[PDB]
Amino acid sequence: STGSATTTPIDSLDDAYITPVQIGTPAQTLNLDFDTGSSDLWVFSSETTASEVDGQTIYTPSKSTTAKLLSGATWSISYDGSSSSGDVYTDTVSVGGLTVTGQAVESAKKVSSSFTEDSTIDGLLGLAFSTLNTVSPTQQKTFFDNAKASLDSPVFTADLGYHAPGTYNFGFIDTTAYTGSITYTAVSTKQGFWEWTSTGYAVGSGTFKSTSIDGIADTGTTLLYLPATVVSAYWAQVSGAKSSSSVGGYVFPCSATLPSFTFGVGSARIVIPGDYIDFGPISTGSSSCFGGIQSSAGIGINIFGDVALKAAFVVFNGATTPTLGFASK
């Protein structure tokens, strides 16, 4: 089997991407944030505290003839400071024509304010390794983990758009969706993430610096978080850019034209255009703009979030030894 679904930015800044997901019988379609950095499929629901729902579409398990309460099971996740928790159903879940029966659907009883305030995101669909799933007392599998054995090939791909729709495919690699070749690189699953090591970077037309940068491929993170040395080298090329303690990261004059940023994947190179690094005014009407490359110092891990991933066609290879692949597009 295969599946193919379009993923759409939630706003004009590409803050996150939503993908329609069919849950239950008859189908209830919710727009979920596919997150390769976490491992829970959770949804706003008829059980979510009413004051914490503000425009989201909810899952109502009592209206699904295939929903079954997973007795005794609860979940709770803390992400960036946001959080959510609740109970668990199993139900039929379909993405882009690929169906899993008996998928754990984590129904929120509580969500934190940042979820409530984002009317466009009806929940998360985790695509990291199932060892990070939070369901207790019996940990549950991700959608991909449940689908894997049925897929034509045990893979999914992320093809995120810049200010435009893109695609998540399951079970096949669309050879028309990228240019050149896919370069594969080793993954460590020891922290539950799609963790890999970039071979270095360049700023604009500058010379490539060969250096190992260990980080995660995370579709659920907006920005690119890298070591402070790398980030300082980038922003030094932008007149007037500065790290602002009060704003919480590097800011730059909105009048600037930003340089590109290149990252290494083996001997291959992925180029992030400068415009992908502009996240617009820090507050409405300001002429100070927020940067899309930020320090990972104090996160504890480097994060190749959407800023980086949307410059590439990315293969999440869930073979017995997982690997990642990157191609230009």
Ligand SMILES: CCC[C@@H](NN)c1nnnn1Cc1ccccc1
């Ligand atoms: C180890 C990160 C996992 C990641 N899952 N999408 C996440 N989970 N919660 N937030 N993120 C992103 C983030 C965290 C800290 C600072 C900036 C971005």
